[PDB]
Amino acid sequence: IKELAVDEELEKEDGLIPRQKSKLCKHGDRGMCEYCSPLPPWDKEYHEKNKIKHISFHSYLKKLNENANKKENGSSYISPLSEPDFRINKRCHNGHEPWPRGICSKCQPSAITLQQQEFRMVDHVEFQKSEIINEFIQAWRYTGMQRFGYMYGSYSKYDNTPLGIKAVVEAIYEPPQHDEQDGLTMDVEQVKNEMLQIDRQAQEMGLSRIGLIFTDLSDAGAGDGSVFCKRHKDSFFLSSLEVIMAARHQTRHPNVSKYSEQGFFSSKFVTCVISGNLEGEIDISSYQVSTEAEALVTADMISGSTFPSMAYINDTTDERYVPEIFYMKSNEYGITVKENAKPAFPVDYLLVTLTHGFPNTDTETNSKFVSSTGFPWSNRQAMGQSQDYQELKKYLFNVASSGDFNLLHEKISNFHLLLYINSLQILSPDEWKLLIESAVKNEWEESLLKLVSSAGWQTLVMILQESG
Amino acid sequence: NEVGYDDIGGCRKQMAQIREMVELPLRHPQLFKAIGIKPPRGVLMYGPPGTGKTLMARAVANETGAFFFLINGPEVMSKMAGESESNLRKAFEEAEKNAPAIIFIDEIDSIAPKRDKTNGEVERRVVSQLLTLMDGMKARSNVVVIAATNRPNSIDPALRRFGRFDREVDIGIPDATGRLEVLRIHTKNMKLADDVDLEALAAETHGYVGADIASLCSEAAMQQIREKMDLLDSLGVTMDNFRFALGNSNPSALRETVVESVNVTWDDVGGLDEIKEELKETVEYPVLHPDQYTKFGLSPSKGVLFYGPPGTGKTLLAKAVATEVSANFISVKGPELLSMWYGESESNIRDIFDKARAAAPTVVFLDQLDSIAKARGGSLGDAGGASDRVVNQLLTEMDGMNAKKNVFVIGATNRPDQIDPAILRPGRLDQLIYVPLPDENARLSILNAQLRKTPLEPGLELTAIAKATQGFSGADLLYIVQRAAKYAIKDSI
Amino acid sequence: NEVGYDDIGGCRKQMAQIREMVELPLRHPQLFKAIGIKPPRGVLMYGPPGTGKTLMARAVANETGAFFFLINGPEVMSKMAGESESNLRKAFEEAEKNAPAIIFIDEIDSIAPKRDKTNGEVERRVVSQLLTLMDGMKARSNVVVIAATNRPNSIDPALRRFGRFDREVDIGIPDATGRLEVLRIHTKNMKLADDVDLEALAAETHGYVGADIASLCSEAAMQQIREKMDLDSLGVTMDNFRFALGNSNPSALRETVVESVNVTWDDVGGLDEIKEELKETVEYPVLHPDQYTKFGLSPSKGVLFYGPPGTGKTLLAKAVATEVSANFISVKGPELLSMWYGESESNIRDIFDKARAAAPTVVFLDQLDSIAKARGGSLGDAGGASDRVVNQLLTEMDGMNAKKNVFVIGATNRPDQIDPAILRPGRLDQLIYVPLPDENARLSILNAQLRKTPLEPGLELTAIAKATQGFSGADLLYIVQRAAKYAIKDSI
Amino acid sequence: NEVGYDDIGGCRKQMAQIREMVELPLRHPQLFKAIGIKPPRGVLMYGPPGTGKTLMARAVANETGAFFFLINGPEVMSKMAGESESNLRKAFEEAEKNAPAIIFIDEIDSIAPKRDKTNGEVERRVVSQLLTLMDGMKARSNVVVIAATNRPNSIDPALRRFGRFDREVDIGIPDATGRLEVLRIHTKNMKLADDVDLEALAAETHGYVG
Ligand SMILES: Nc1ncnc2c1ncn2[C@@H]1O[C@H](COP(=O)(O)OP(=O)(O)OP(=O)(O)O)[C@@H](O)[C@H]1O
Ligand SMILES: Nc1ncnc2c1ncn2[C@@H]1O[C@H](COP(=O)(O)OP(=O)(O)OP(=O)(O)O)[C@@H](O)[C@H]1O
């Protein structure tokens, strides 16, 4: 099987950390005893020294390869990187062949200790431009209600975190949803039918749906104060209703891995939320879900509770056997061992954090999508920017009826403009594929003149001039 | 894929004890509320290994209709951060939600040791969780707990209370008709020949267990396919394959508690024409006529001290007495002494004393009296408490044992005055039988006894050899006859 | 770069025996159908180190292509929370996921031994995890388990049962030209000369289980490159293997002498009558043991000896180890005596258990006055007494099988400290007092030393022997020891 | 610091046979290819401590220019039985990366004791890691291991069987000429007068370790 091009590059590099000679070393200069030996990239002591709170899963893959492959014979190639299962094997390899009549300890799911995950799949989410997500908050500034979107992007290496993958996003697509002041809830059938055609155009453009965003602002008084502070240390970090939508999105998009026995493991999916800081701004934060316990129990046992920090655990009806969930908390006198014989266990423990950021404006490798970021989006029907062909006379117009190719190609690289053109499918699919590849790639000057000489682009500007 | 119900032979007496115990109140909630007696909620099975502990529990629970919650011994307590109690609390809670249920705790001796052999802190946490949760089943939830173990003395003594574990079921070794019954249900799917005789195999195998009988049929089939192999047509297991399996293999006595009945018949010790009437009143008459002691009220003397000259005296003067019983003989000997410095000094004898009345009939032979209580019972004794724990359990287990079941002990030594005099206390050794030196009328029949399987010419006079033996005992009679067999094979050489 | 079936020789009988229980449950499992029985799982190998236990396990794995697995002794033994009980069942379910598979547990005595010493630790619950794991293997013809150890008596006897571990096999010592097959494997890659011959090496290498043979050819290559002061043609020679015999020790770092002292029949001076009576010992009934079953009587169990010291109680005591080359052992008198009181009866037990396991064997005793102690302990009052050391061997030597080549032989100097039950018939029958040699036997006493040294024939052999008028057999060694430092006298 | 061959004497008959044991397979590994057999991996030294057991390994390391890996005895065995097996795995992996390399360990009796009646120690999981690490790695790799200890009979007999530690050297106390040689070495910088003696000063010691 074949993995991603980014995932195979992190596997080949060892990522060792070099050290220097010290006063504690008693050996010679041409050697190393223990104090200047090469440090492994999975040691968590070096991680918390530089305030890195997770061990960068590609290095966690290396720390399990040392346990799988040894100096001894072995002759196995097991590679035990699989999803730990809480479901019940029906055959059970014993005399209690039905679960209605019989269950023993080798098939019973053990009591969940609630230990936090030490490794994250995505180590650092990054963005492309501050003007891209400024249009997303501007949707709230016009209708006053919450929004929703899906992030399309790619992946590359990250040199800050040892053996880490960074998440790059390029554009944000919004599905048609019904907004509300308190929260939001849309139909999953019309979104999945709409997201199927966007994945078609994302393949030729080199994009993949790897993220989503949802807003939560609660403006205070619209004067000096920006927003309220809903999510803090004493309150919930992520609501339990949005854990369900984050869990189903990770199971729909698996990550291919040759080390896993099933063929897919350790999904690379980000969930970002606009919530605001403690003091005064609308700074965002992102956390992703845990694979070890939460990713498998969401198929059978997650039920909604009235508290945003916790989630209710329901009962067993003849196939849905669940084990007891335990966690430690302080009582009125001291700190005690596991107490939970009670439902509504918290879900903030099962989240691992990420580091969001925006790159510097002075230099970058590329940006690939900065045309205007002011074009009316596809499914923004709550706002007034959902126009017909009247907008195409205002937006591009083949500027001033005779456009220069340095000023014409800079507008054609928009994500939602190219996704609006092919829906009319005036051009051929072969000429459309070279149209979107010219706008997204470099050395575009020889191929842009091929587009203007084609009869399909001439019919597009002729059918636009007669219409309003 | 499970075993049936009638696939167990030899254990029919303990089957009828357990069919009314755990099967009948499980399917019938009535006839206990009407009689006003609550059913027992705990049974304990114990005995030697390889006797049917884990087999009978799966057989009695399958074809009755039950839940059959299985739980293994060493699989629990191997958890981290203290979740073995939650795996035990969810075990008993999920059983009573869909009653009737059976909770079979297999290998309970690996969970509950005694409080003097405690290890760490998680071993105390799981024995007190089990004792608390056992008392919570008094709501008549139709939950029966079956516990199987191997050593009843190593378990914690706080498990047998009024409600936790009241009844105990002991599984003994099968007899000649019992070992024959397991051979019928083990050669069912096997292709057998006509030369085999299962009655002769059960009569030869006396000290065999319920697991050794499976080795006798499986090794003879493996031996037959080692012969039939060349360029599957007929694979009937022959008598010689079972005879070879008796030779190369062995019973369960791998220097454990010995299971054999090696006894010789009469006229195998020479003479005894005035001594045979003195030995017939101690191992036959308590078995043949037990009512003569119950009508009068006397305690039968189950112990006779033996001492005599060199030569004979140890085994052939004691094993020739019990020809009519021929039960299992569990003996102590030379290597069965203080090998472990802690605990295993009289605890290896505690399963001999308490099991003699539970697994009756069982004859225990006692020898090497000068190596157990020589310096410890004397006037000087032991000073320091190092190994003074040997002369206590040999005396305090005498008054605590009555003549309820068939018990028998025999003490034999070469020096009768080298043992502690409290072993010869009244009430236990009131019958003292002395085996004397064989005279001239008995030494000639000794030479006719130890020359049994020999091609002896009857034309010679064996009296003339024995007439020159006055201070020569039966060992010197064995010494004078071994040299006669050395030069006899040299004539063939 | 893996080994195969032809990689090791010398154990060809044990190779064809162990190949039946691995190929037939995997290649052709249809023979177990329509016969009723179930194919077994456990194979038990045991022997001395350096015999190739792990070599035979890897050779049968690569020659079949099965899913081989390895479980080490000291590796998986945890003290954290019982993790050894979770990692044993983890290895069993991983071997059950791939068919066919084979696991290997070396040094199985290190994982949960017999409870004569520990009896209270977690190893009691470790072995009981292995009982229910092997008995719950209802998956037919999938997993075959093999094990390797060095002492079969230190393991718990619950493993030797029907289900888990039956069909044990002892990997013996390649004495019947088996070292020639080991030399054919190791020396086939080295460059050889014409003077070498592998048949002239196995006859002189007593023991030599195989690990030291691989060390012998490597050390012979070190002697060949030693003369090179430094295009290259080295080879080997016969003198390189003769250099490696004397300048390298055989497998005797644990015990000094256990095999022999390199003597023969005619190294004891005189005493031709006891040479005839020594032909009624274990030389006699081994090649014909059915005559005693025909005649219906057990053979002689023990012959005892006592007399003047220095008359052949170490030469003739070690001459039995050379006239049959049996599994000899060497144990001293108070070396059997231990410092612990509870060990006073088990130390004779493991010695006698090795005698019935290494049949045919030769044992002996020296200075039984420290062992017999006919009074039975001097005073008492202690936590332990000197009474269980003699009362245990008098009963254990009676509880031995007659057809197992077990016997005793004595060498004492005091006939009064020994107990009358020690000299009992059936345990020590022939009361043979060793005599002082007369004038007809003291001529070959000096000739026992003159066989190897080049004595001048002009010197009269009986002139020095005629000076003895009641001397012992060791006193004529003192003359040739005095002459060993009186013969040179000018060559400094 | 930077020691050489001419810094110690006395054991020169054993120093010559050491130079054919650790320098000859490293400088000329193709000589064992022509003879067929593999070069030896483990040679250990013993004797009284303080005859220069640690200085002998540093002298042959600086006189060859190879990599010098060092694992201390009472340092890596004092951990909680979990990092010692990974330190030995890191020891053989780093020496393979920068071949030619030597591996010097000292006080192996603290790592490898014998099994006796006084059970209760750890005694496992570290030496068994050294058993499965040392029997491999012989695919003409330029690596050798050198052990050092005080009591040569307290070591476990499984190490000195074959292929792991097969060659041994006995560096003991020097003779009268051996202490005379180290007296000239240790007095090369002290500006002494002509009144001092060397043969009489060495003969008046007669039991002095180096
Ligand atoms: N009536 C019987 N008594 C004893 N054993 C039997 C009987 N019938 C069959 N067996 C054989 O004995 C085995 C069952 O023994 P079991 O599993 O009970 O061992 P145990 O020592 O009695 O208990 P445990 O399993 O706890 O050691 C079966 O594999 C079967 O072949
Ligand atoms: N009727 C008999 N009278 C005398 N000796 C006999 C007789 N039958 C057999 N023997 C022989 O005498 C021996 C009996 O000796 P035994 O085993 O009693 O030794 P012991 O020293 O008397 O026993 P202990 O060690 O208890 O004193 C047997 O080996 C047997 O060959």
Ligand SMILES: Nc1ncnc2c1ncn2[C@@H]1O[C@H](COP(=O)(O)OP(=O)(O)OP(=O)(O)O)[C@@H](O)[C@H]1O
């Ligand atoms: N056919 C053979 N028979 C005996 N020895 C051999 C054979 N072939 C090679 N040898 C030598 O014997 C040694 C095999 O010993 P091995 O590695 O099995 O030690 P072991 O102690 O048996 O293993 P374990 O530690 O599992 O008990 C090898 O080093 C090899 O040189």
Ligand SMILES: Nc1ncnc2c1ncn2[C@@H]1O[C@H](COP(=O)(O)OP(=O)(O)OP(=O)(O)O)[C@@H](O)[C@H]1O
């Ligand atoms: N046939 C012989 N007769 C007498 N002496 C011999 C004979 N052959 C060799 N010797 C010499 O006599 C010595 C034998 O003495 P031995 O070792 O038996 O001492 P011992 O005191 O008899 O033994 P123990 O310590 O068991 O009493 C040998 O050193 C040997 O040189």
Ligand SMILES: Nc1ncnc2c1ncn2[C@@H]1O[C@H](COP(=O)(O)OP(=O)(O)OP(=O)(O)O)[C@@H](O)[C@H]1O
């Ligand atoms: N040839 C020599 N013989 C003896 N001593 C020497 C020699 N050359 C130098 N020395 C001195 O002896 C010391 C060597 O001791 P070393 O460092 O070996 O301690 P050690 O206790 O032997 O090492 P370890 O800690 O490994 O046991 C050096 O400090 C050095 O000054």
Ligand SMILES: [Zn+2]
């Ligand atoms: Zn260092």
Ligand SMILES: [Zn+2]
């Ligand atoms: Zn199950």
